[PDB]
Design a binder for these strands. Sequence first.
RNA 1: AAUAUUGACCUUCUUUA
RNA 2: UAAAGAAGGUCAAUAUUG
Lengths: 213, 212, 217, 218
Amino acid sequence: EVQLQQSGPELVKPGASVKMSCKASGYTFANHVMHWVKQKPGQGLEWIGYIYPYNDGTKYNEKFKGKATLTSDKSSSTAYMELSSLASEDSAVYYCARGGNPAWFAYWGQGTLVTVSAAKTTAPSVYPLAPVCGSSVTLGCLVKGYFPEPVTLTWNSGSLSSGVHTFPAVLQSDLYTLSSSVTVTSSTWPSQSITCNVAHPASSTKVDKKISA
Amino acid sequence: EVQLQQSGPELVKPGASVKMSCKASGYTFANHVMHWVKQKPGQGLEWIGYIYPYNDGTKYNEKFKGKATLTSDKSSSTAYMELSSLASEDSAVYYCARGGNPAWFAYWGQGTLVTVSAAKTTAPSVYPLAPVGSSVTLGCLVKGYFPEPVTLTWNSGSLSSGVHTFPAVLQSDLYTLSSSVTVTSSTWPSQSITCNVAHPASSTKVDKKISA
Amino acid sequence: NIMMTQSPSSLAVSAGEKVTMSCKSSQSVLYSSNQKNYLAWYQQKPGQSPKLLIYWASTRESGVPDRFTGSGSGTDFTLTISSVQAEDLAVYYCHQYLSSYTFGGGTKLEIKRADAAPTVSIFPPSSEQLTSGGASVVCFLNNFYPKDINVKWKIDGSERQNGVLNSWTDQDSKDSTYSMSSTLTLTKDEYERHNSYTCEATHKTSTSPIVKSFNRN
Amino acid sequence: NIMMTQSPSSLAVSAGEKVTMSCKSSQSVLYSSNQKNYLAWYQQKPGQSPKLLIYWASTRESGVPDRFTGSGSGTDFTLTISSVQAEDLAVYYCHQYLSSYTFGGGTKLEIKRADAAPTVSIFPPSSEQLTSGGASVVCFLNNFYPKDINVKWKIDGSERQNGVLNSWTDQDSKDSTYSMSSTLTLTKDEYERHNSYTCEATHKTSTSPIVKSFNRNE
RNA sequence: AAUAUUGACCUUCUUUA
RNA sequence: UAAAGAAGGUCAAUAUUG
């Protein structure tokens, strides 16, 4: 029942600031501490600080003092994390974690990816993949040329979760490219509608490309 | 003009309790902390605990947790310490000392001697010691009393120079003390020299004039 | 304020066998008041957030399987998995919460599995991309083991090295196998100037390469 | 929670010379925030309460003479006295107040001084004690140096060893000399059965013994 | 109920401007 | 008056238990 829903991704220009949120539910907001954890790409975890919503009391990591500012809003039971004067080393994923007072981490959020770059947004181009012209068939969905990360992909709105392979995004020519595959039985295609759902929140893009013969 | 005046000595029966007071003056009693310290006869010092008179908070030494209780009275600027279930090891001098919050010891009281014993009290027997040129010595003998301490002064403190008070000596389950004072042959027998003794445990005080 | 050290960085075992990982703290994390070890273990699967496994060194959090078990006290601690499942592929961090909050380096767990041949499939450019002026040929290689694999593109029998984009996945949560995607991107003009397109795969499970091609027609 | 240890339990110097004492703590008493050493020195003269001398290891409290100076940092500290006065006779404790409150063992200071001959005085019993039935002969020996002295009572030339009570003082705060009192207690009956009473003291300042006597009704 | 802990408020102390 | 640190008290909560 305890859930922590964090805001979506954000692209920030160097030197600017940003403010993210963590909405709590399933417990007494003021009775527990809300931590914040950083994780650079391909690296480990790191503690930043925490807030006590009852009095809005702060406790920061020495290295993040002046970089991060924590606040809370009991009316919406939401905690906020503001980061100032962002730089290259600030690009990372940021989690919100509940504890006690203070206790240990016990519930995490999905995270919020942050990209610090001067480059501007670019929406992808989705393309369907079908065989040319056995007992199984494999279809694909190409997501080419977008910035920044991330991008979501779901086959048949999520009803198709077995036999799917989503490949990590690769950077090339200053743009990201992604791909995905799904395998089904020969009897399931083309006798059933198979469609690719793609969403690029930065560009507010949402496409649904059906795989045709 | 910070001054700490403690209460008089006490003779306590084993197993009983005792409470002493430390009256403060010359500063804001509430703003500063009042420590208490123990000093066994012939040994060093030992910290017991302290109290914050403003809100009456206390912090105790682990060794004196169930032995001491610290209270205060802001209306009279008086600190109190109570000892419970006294044994022989609790016989010692107990000081009160002021600091800050908590800071360090800055002012000390004169001390309170506590004697734990079931032996009855015995008041002393004072005797003037008179002689049989240019310099004469007179003495005063405090014989056979219990327990300690005893107070001895010459002419109610008016005579302080050239005085030798000797430590008490235990013998036959009783204490004995003596004191000497040297003056000029022109100051005695013309000018009166008197010995003043006091024994708190027996509630006695005597004035023995040194007569020729 | 207390430094954690996890060793080894990487570990590989077969599915269904035991594993043990170590966490060493510089100072002791045993608190004298409650006589508890302020140590916790967390799991992080690929693409997910951390998850609490164990706290107080040995107490297992509710909802966690019985395969995980914590042990140790003072400065040496151990996380054990009685039987490793394919889903257990993740990185595990040890955490102390007695003096501030510090994390360990993490330990990656790999699952050993039998050999598996890749399944290759090729896809010509889509009419959508063609009308836009581009042509991308995608080549999927799914569910193979071990991970060492080499792909080669050929146009009309001639090897091509430029304009290729490859991406690899981690071990699957159910199969513990690997997959790979390879895409070759050309212009619509050059794409229509050739007839044959080929995927050449090199894997340990076959001495000759796995080939998959299609001809414009 | 931090243990203090003073090296010189007892030490003696001549009047007018400098002195140095050490205090060693188990852990460091230097706080990093304010960069201060939580160490203090206290003096306790014979028969009095402690008195604050130095705090913050080197800061001298107001009203204390300039002869005392504190020094050190971390775990090794030293208290120095430029010129020893007769009043400086006392015991000195070092104190830590960073982690709880702990004291040192203390250091006793003795004052070396030139020789001094004893001044002896004898006192017959008082009419008060006599009416009660007792007789005590007191013998005062004041302001002598060194401290080594032996006193013996004689009745009509015969040495008596029982029923004697002796008490000694510490070095004087002005003279740095010693004093002693000797009391011989008998009953009035036995007291009136002899004529001469004498206390005889042996000291380094005289080759022959110091004699002081009185005769009953002479 | 007891111990311990985090934060806020209040009084006060300490090191500095 | 302002900054930092410390002691106690009250309040909300968390942890260890009985």
